[PDB]
Paper text:
All [name] domains fold into two 4-helix bundles with up-down-up-down topology. Analysis of the surface charge distribution in the different [name] domains revealed a highly basic central cavity, which is surrounded by two basic surface patches on each side. The basic amino acids contributing to these surface patches are highly conserved among different [name] proteins.
We next compared the refined structures of the plant [name] domain to the bacterial CtCHAD and ygiF structures. Analytical size-exclusion chromatography experiments indicated that the different [name] proteins adopt different oligomeric states in solution, with ygiF and SsCHAD behaving as monomers, whereas unliganded CtCHAD form dimers in solution (see the Discussion section). Addition of a long-chain polyP shifted CtCHAD into tetrameric and higher oligomeric states. The sensograms of CtCHAD and ygiF binding to polyP could only be explained using a heterogeneous analyte model.
Residue numbers in the entry:
A (entry chain A), B (entry chain A), C (entry chain A), D (entry chain A): 207 to 522
Write the structure that this text describes.
Amino acid sequence: MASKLRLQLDAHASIHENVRRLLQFTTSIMEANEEGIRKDIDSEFLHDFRVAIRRSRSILRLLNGVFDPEKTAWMLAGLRELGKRTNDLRDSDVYLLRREEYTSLLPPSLRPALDPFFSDLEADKRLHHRQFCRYLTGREYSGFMTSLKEFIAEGELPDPETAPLAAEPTGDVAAKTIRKALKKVLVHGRRTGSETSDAELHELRIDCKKLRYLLEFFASLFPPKATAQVLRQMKTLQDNLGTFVDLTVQMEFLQSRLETIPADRGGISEAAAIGGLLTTLYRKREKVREHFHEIFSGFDSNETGELFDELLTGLA
Amino acid sequence: MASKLRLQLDAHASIHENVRRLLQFTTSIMEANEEGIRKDIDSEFLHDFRVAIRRSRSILRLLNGVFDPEKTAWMLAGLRELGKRTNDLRDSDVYLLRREEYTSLLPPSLRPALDPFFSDLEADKRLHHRQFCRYLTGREYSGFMTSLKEFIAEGELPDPETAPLAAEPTGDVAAKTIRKALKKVLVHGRRTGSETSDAELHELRIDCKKLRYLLEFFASLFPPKATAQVLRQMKTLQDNLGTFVDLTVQMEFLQSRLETIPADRGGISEAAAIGGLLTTLYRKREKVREHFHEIFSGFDSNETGELFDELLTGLA
Amino acid sequence: MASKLRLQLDAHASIHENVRRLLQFTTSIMEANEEGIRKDIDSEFLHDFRVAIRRSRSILRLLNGVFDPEKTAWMLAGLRELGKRTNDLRDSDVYLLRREEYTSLLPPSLRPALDPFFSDLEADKRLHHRQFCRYLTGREYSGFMTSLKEFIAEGELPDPETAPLAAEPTGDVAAKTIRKALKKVLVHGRRTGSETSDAELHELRIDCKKLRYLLEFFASLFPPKATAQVLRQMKTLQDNLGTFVDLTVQMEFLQSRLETIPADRGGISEAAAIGGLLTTLYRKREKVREHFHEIFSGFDSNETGELFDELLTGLA
Amino acid sequence: MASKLRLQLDAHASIHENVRRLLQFTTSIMEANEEGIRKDIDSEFLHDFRVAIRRSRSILRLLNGVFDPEKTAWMLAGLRELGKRTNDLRDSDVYLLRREEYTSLLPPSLRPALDPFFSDLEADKRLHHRQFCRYLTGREYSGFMTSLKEFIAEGELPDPETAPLAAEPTGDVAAKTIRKALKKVLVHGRRTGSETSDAELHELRIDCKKLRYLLEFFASLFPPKATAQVLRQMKTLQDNLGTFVDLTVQMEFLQSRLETIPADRGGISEAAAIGGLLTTLYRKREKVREHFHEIFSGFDSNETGELFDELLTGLA
């Protein structure tokens, strides 16, 4: 319930006012999810907490200059540290949720060796849940969140010589940053020759995310159909890049677990099961890679250019 | 924004009161989505409209006896007719959204023959959108929705001899129907021998949906972690059955389009492209079928039984 | 050059005479391949040596009763022992030949862990080659082969009360055993319901091999087109069963290697690579299993019945 | 029985003498297969006939200069025309043999539409068999084969100024052409960047075939183990290129049939079935393409260089 909600923004208000409203929104989502994290109700609470952090940090970087550099660095560092504090707990949840999926991919002879693997994930989950709850109930977290909400409540415009973007009308900044983000997707996707490297796809996934975040933040400035059509136009490409990277992340996680499997007889069976998963995910990922070129060429169309022009029409 | 929202229910109120609150909720979602359907903002509006209808009808059947038989039949028939009125428009949206996905599956030589296919879908979409908007702005729709909201606002309990379930406490009905729905999933899944037929999987998908709908309707009666854990336990199985049936539905749609392709030279190329999609979806669906047995056996576990017992503890 | 060569048989000679000509043929192929085995020229020499053994043993069992029971048991036991003596050497050759195939299936991160695996196979190959060459140059092998060629050169018919089939005309025995072998394929394939178990497919593969061996042994008794058409009719089914079992055998080999991987850190990486291969072969094998029912139903046709009738016409 | 047979060559005889022995061999295989083609016993007879033609033409081009230019052109043109005369008949046989394979790939709903497709192939087969038998029994074929065997029986060395290679010792020509063919595989495979184009793979398949043909022609000049090891080293790469091109050829055949399917209602169903096959073969071919880079890099190794050096040692 964090990526599905939109703000009502005034296109004529300063970008400073509207980014502060964004951060009031995302910090409210953070705090609203603490109780569910603490009570370990469901994995979705930590996920929305993380989504709010990630969108906050990404917009703060895209709109660098709306706030003073010191305050910007401070918000980015505290939010980065907070997100990193959730990584181990988030990993435990995600791979536990994949247990039956992963088990079904393997031969029957290799399925039992995953049981100790998942029991160890459950033990990790309890450890990292306790650790992150002490963090959440701690003064250092309380202090950062209190300072952050106080700062974003400060409506006075910053020094324009150190925060040059702050006083700019929201519509102007939206037009300029969305055009910039679109150009970055198109240029980078066109640069993607035949090699279709891991690095290129990883970057382009982030390029598309930045574009999406901007569209969702500024949605209320545009006719709703126009925003919705641009988001739809991006979806197949984003799904291809997202699955490619997600499979990469899963393979990186499983590879790191191989490095710390016990070097003994029970480890051998677990290693074979983990190798089976790595290999199957690898094969899946190469099929996804095979489709990237067509899907991007279909995105890089005249209709796509026209839809962004129709979106941004009448802005400067 | 219809499948993600939960009601606050009183476990001690009559089931009649709480099912009326369900229907006030689902009808409100219906009406809230009319404007977006009419303005053709995005496909999600019709989807949530349909989800609200489908969950309303399914709960009304699961809880047959909360309302008088004539009123029950009337609500089911009007909601069925309303849903069926959305089918053609919904199909146009869904297969248009699949355009780049479908195009990427085919050899380059067959991709161009899909362009007239999708232009014809777009023409269908405009036709069915105009037709469904005249329906939405019509007196017959207005009249049904007005009568339905008036009926669900009538708080007097019905004749217990013709609506025997109405006066029952909500907690009792929840316990009995969730246990019944769970038993139906387990029995039917165990009956699924090696043949793993289309009919068996289609039925079991509906069995799982009924169970899920009941859990989501009655969620607020239980500790949140307990509800969330039961829903998570079901997810991999539901995803397997859901993909199996969804691929079936897509194949049935593409098969019906083959029957009406023009019997001429341009039709030949389109038919080859449609055959390529049918065949590829078929191959995907058989791999999904291959995983059903393992995924169900993993669902049909002692932990699953224990979680439902913990969910329903203290109820009768 | 053992499975591709046919004998010229006289349909009116006794089956005893013609099975002795078969065994003179297969033993000649055995001896002709010794030099290439000894000089380790290529893997094909041991393969043809094994093919000749396997076809000899299988026909001896199918035509039980052409020879006295003691001589039959003696030939079967000596040929079985000889074949088993080639298994380790044959395995080394086969999996060494699969090295690049296997390496290409794995993620880059798992490919290096196969290098010690294949170096150990090469060491095994040299060991088992030396062992089997001492065997080949030994008196015990020389003695068995000398006794076997002397026995098959003995043209006197055996005691008909202990070898009741020996004096039967070749055409009669061909007709009866080919019809019996065909019925066994059809019955067993029809018994294969939806479970399509490993045991059923393993058996049916052998049923088809026995039928093929009989057709190839008795080929010269029939019009060449008729034999060739029956063999072609069987091919797709035999290829499906053959790949199914071959993948099973490869998985069994890789599973046995997992059991003896060192329980230490270098073993962990090798185990992951072996698990990746096992899993990928497993997935391939389930797709092959998925096609069995259609392929068998296509073999179990009226045309197939008619072709065998045309093959055997005029015989009793 | 044409690609499996080797000549005994004298390394010190002129290349002219030994290429004439090659052509006596390949023409003998051609004539030996006429009867089986005429009686339509099995598809293998036309296949070996074609293999003999293809290897004859390829060696004649690789060793251009062993014969006078006019005689070389004459042999190449007559052999090319003869091979082309077999193409339609060969296609009928090959796709008829694929009937059950192709049928098993398709959804049940599309399988019946292939029956008229294969009945039409059978009708084509009978047509092209009758046509090619009139050709085989004709004076024009008889005359060419008589002239060809007379020419290859002419042992006098040709004019060295117009056939400069003829008098060269066989060992020298073998060393030079095998080294040249190997370099051409390695250079072209290394030039294959990430694009891995259809053209590049098609060419490299032919590069590998030329190398293989030379090794098999000159096999008896080298220690048998050395030849066998070089052929084994090439096998996985040749299998990858061979499957890639074979799938391409099958797709080209099915694409050409789409162009001539009747533009009417029965054609629509057949087109969908053909499109399903095209698409499935396409997907298979892209997976094969995905493995090319690894398989080639494994072939392009130090061991491969060393094995060719050991093969050619002591030659100039």
